[PDB]
Design an enzyme around this catalytic site. Sequence first.
Site, PDB file in Angstrom:
ATOM      1  CB  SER A   1       3.780  -2.373  -6.148  1.00 29.64           C
ATOM      2  OG  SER A   1       4.583  -3.516  -5.909  1.00 29.64           O
TER       3      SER A   1
ATOM      4  CE  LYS B   1       2.342  -0.214   4.227  1.00 27.51           C
ATOM      5  NZ  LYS B   1       2.677   1.000   5.022  1.00 27.51           N
TER       6      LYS B   1
ATOM      7  NE  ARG C   1       6.854  10.371  -0.210  1.00 29.99           N
ATOM      8  CZ  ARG C   1       7.675  11.108   0.530  1.00 29.99           C
ATOM      9  NH1 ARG C   1       8.332  12.122  -0.017  1.00 29.99           N
ATOM     10  NH2 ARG C   1       7.837  10.832   1.818  1.00 29.99           N
ATOM     11  CG  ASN C   2       3.532   9.538   3.039  1.00 32.94           C
ATOM     12  OD1 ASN C   2       3.418   8.497   2.392  1.00 32.94           O
ATOM     13  ND2 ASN C   2       4.704   9.983   3.476  1.00 32.94           N
TER      14      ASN C   2
ATOM     15  CG  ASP D   1       4.158   6.441   5.723  1.00 35.78           C
ATOM     16  OD1 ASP D   1       4.101   5.202   5.576  1.00 35.78           O
ATOM     17  OD2 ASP D   1       5.202   7.104   5.546  1.00 35.78           O
TER      18      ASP D   1
ATOM     19  CG  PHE E   1       5.855  -0.598   0.612  1.00 36.30           C
ATOM     20  CD1 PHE E   1       6.256   0.058  -0.542  1.00 36.30           C
ATOM     21  CD2 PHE E   1       4.510  -0.904   0.769  1.00 36.30           C
ATOM     22  CE1 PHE E   1       5.336   0.392  -1.520  1.00 36.30           C
ATOM     23  CE2 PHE E   1       3.589  -0.575  -0.205  1.00 36.30           C
ATOM     24  CZ  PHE E   1       4.002   0.075  -1.351  1.00 36.30           C
TER      25      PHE E   1
ATOM     26  CG  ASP F   1       7.520   9.571   5.142  1.00 45.79           C
ATOM     27  OD1 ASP F   1       8.197  10.427   4.535  1.00 45.79           O
ATOM     28  OD2 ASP F   1       7.046   8.557   4.586  1.00 45.79           O
TER      29      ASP F   1
HETATM   30  N1  LIG Z   1      -6.588   4.091   1.073  1.00 48.67           N
HETATM   31  C1  LIG Z   1      -5.980   4.404  -0.096  1.00 48.67           C
HETATM   32  N2  LIG Z   1      -6.696   4.872  -1.139  1.00 48.67           N
HETATM   33  C2  LIG Z   1      -6.111   5.195  -2.307  1.00 48.67           C
HETATM   34  N3  LIG Z   1      -4.792   5.089  -2.544  1.00 48.67           N
HETATM   35  C3  LIG Z   1      -3.954   4.631  -1.586  1.00 48.67           C
HETATM   36  C4  LIG Z   1      -4.515   4.256  -0.277  1.00 48.67           C
HETATM   37  N4  LIG Z   1      -3.481   3.842   0.480  1.00 48.67           N
HETATM   38  C5  LIG Z   1      -2.361   3.945  -0.279  1.00 48.67           C
HETATM   39  N5  LIG Z   1      -2.640   4.416  -1.509  1.00 48.67           N
HETATM   40  C6  LIG Z   1      -1.635   4.650  -2.575  1.00 48.67           C
HETATM   41  O1  LIG Z   1      -0.373   4.292  -2.012  1.00 48.67           O
HETATM   42  C7  LIG Z   1       0.439   5.447  -1.788  1.00 48.67           C
HETATM   43  C8  LIG Z   1       0.486   5.772  -0.298  1.00 48.67           C
HETATM   44  O2  LIG Z   1       0.720   4.590   0.467  1.00 48.67           O
HETATM   45  P1  LIG Z   1       1.736   4.652   1.715  1.00 48.67           P
HETATM   46  O3  LIG Z   1       1.048   4.202   2.983  1.00 48.67           O
HETATM   47  O4  LIG Z   1       2.445   5.983   1.661  1.00 48.67           O
HETATM   48  O5  LIG Z   1       2.786   3.507   1.294  1.00 48.67           O
HETATM   49  P2  LIG Z   1       4.275   3.508   1.900  1.00 48.67           P
HETATM   50  O6  LIG Z   1       4.040   3.686   3.380  1.00 48.67           O
HETATM   51  O7  LIG Z   1       4.826   2.160   1.504  1.00 48.67           O
HETATM   52  O8  LIG Z   1       4.949   4.689   1.239  1.00 48.67           O
HETATM   53  C9  LIG Z   1      -0.176   6.597  -2.562  1.00 48.67           C
HETATM   54  O9  LIG Z   1       0.569   6.827  -3.762  1.00 48.67           O
HETATM   55  C10 LIG Z   1      -1.582   6.140  -2.891  1.00 48.67           C
HETATM   56  O10 LIG Z   1      -1.869   6.377  -4.272  1.00 48.67           O
HETATM   57 MG   LIG Z   2       5.684   6.831   1.125  1.00 48.76          MG
END
Ligand SMILES: Nc1ncnc2c1ncn2[C@@H]1O[C@H](COP(=O)(O)OP(=O)(O)O)[C@@H](O)[C@H]1O
Ligand SMILES: [Mg+2]
Lengths: 293, 269
Positions: free
Chosen positions: A33, A58, A154-155, A168, A36, A150
């Site tokens: 969370s 998402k 994290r991604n 991402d 975004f 990016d």
């Molecule tokens: N398909 C998924 N399975 C498990 N965790 C996910 C998944 N998608 C997102 N996450 C969680 O969300 C984060 C990555 O999402 P992300 O697309 O990077 O969000 P943002 O783009 O807002 O940064 C990670 O910390 C992950 O733990």
């Molecule tokens: Mg991110």
Amino acid sequence: LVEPLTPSGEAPNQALLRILKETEFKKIKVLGSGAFGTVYKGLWIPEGEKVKIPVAIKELREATSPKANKEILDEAYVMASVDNPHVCRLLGICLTSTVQLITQLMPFGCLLDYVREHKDNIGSQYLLNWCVQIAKGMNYLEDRRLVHRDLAARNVLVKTPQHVKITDFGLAKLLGAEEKEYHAVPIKWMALESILHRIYTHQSDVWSYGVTVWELMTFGSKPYDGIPASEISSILEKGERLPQPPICTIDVYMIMRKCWMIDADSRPKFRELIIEFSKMARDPQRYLVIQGD
Amino acid sequence: VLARIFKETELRKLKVLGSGVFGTVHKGVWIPEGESIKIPVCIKVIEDKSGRQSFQAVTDHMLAIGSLDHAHIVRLLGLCPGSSLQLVTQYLPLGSLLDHVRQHRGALGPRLLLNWGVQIAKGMYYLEEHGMVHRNLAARNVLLKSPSQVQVADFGVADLLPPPIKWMALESIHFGKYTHQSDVWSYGVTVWELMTFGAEPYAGLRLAEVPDLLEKGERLAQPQICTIDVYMVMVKCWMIDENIRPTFKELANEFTRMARDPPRYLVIK
Ligand SMILES: Nc1ncnc2c1ncn2[C@@H]1O[C@H](COP(=O)(O)OP(=O)(O)O)[C@@H](O)[C@H]1O
Ligand SMILES: [Mg+2]
Ligand SMILES: Nc1ncnc2c1ncn2[C@@H]1O[C@H](COP(=O)(O)OP(=O)(O)NP(=O)(O)O)[C@@H](O)[C@H]1O
Ligand SMILES: [Mg+2]
């Protein structure tokens, strides 16, 4: 009185954008969370098809601002266009007040979190493999001419300990033929030119890749912590880079500081990275000293 | 840009062409005052359900409709007031775009399809720039002037009657609110008709099921011949929040961009 033709001679994008209703999937738990929006873990049950698919859903929080969602629709476009074992693919979107992207769930989630929680049960041969898979994914992304602006730990999502994917694409931009550069954000992962001139290229994602591998080799350490986003430009102009990870040999650290060279062409290509990390992965204990293996 | 007024004896209705939601369209003829000439026209009869005895005098929702002319809209030759309002337009023998794409199907070039997208868009742009809201845009209401030229029809007719579900936006269905962006929604559905070669929107379903279906997040599926880029447009047309939806300027421009490369955005063989 027709538009005159000027053909591009580029292939049509026949990506299928599937559209689902919100009653086809349920939201179970929250995975992430922020401003975004929110990423949920949930179950998708297609209509008439009876498979239950664990999915990440998402959902965008500022529905009403136009280009918050212009950015969501570009994101959805890209994620629906890619097809690769090491890149996450869109399964479809739900159009409501709120846009909801829907992807296949990755049980182990974030890779940064993974190399942090499992710090000392991780051998050299998993880390090198991860580097290989990420390089492969980015290589596929490169030859589809889209730049992942990016790339970071994290991604990177984890399907299995032996299989990870890239995600991402919220900042990712498509480059047309004879569009070498993109003129436009996480400061400690970007190339110097991306900070100074807002230029993004495939060679900038190589800088991001280097920082990523550094995160993995330091088992989820924070890049330049204690150093603020303000000053890093200057440190990079003095020639200062990220430190050599304790497990890394001089060759591995050579490659990653090669990713952080000022001249963007002097930096390796993802092709090269796949080759070299595959070669290291055939004998991991010779390139990474991690005992407990 | 000037509205002509006919007297009821100058007009004569020959054959019924068809009836719709608002009025009934007759193929008829014009015989001016004191002349014996018969000029083939299209006379659309709208019944007066105002109770105030609406149509005995020219109102200027009427001159407003009559004072519009554009290359890609159906010009209103004249109107005739009375118990029933009569809207006289040119008789376009080539018929509706819907029937055309249904009959020729894939045989039409992708360049034609993209171009018709553009034309419908600039017609609608002319209408919106002059404050005219259509309230009934569909493939059935786009007529062929030329084999390559299309014109938007039946505009402004809806606010002749007192206070089509498959071409209407959600706010229109729920709250009877009609905007230029509801016309954008309708445009998206129209283009969907076009590139599916005259498919019926939400065929298997029933009219009751459609608005809620929309509100639950589902849409008209991606047309077989449509690239992701073209379908993305229709998708943004079908957004629930109005101010997110594209404007006609942009719709015209992007369909123009696509028209400058037909095979990259539509795949027909
Ligand atoms: N398909 C998924 N399975 C498990 N965790 C996910 C998944 N998608 C997102 N996450 C969680 O969300 C984060 C990555 O999402 P992300 O697309 O990077 O969000 P943002 O783009 O807002 O940064 C990670 O910390 C992950 O733990
Ligand atoms: Mg991110
Ligand atoms: N200018 C025109 N030339 C030839 N045929 C026309 C013209 N205008 C309308 N028509 C025909 O009129 C018939 C029915 O008229 P009408 O009911 O007003 O249109 P519609 O197709 O039912 N759409 P709508 O009534 O707005 O929901 C259709 O078959 C049209 O092809
Ligand atoms: Mg009509």
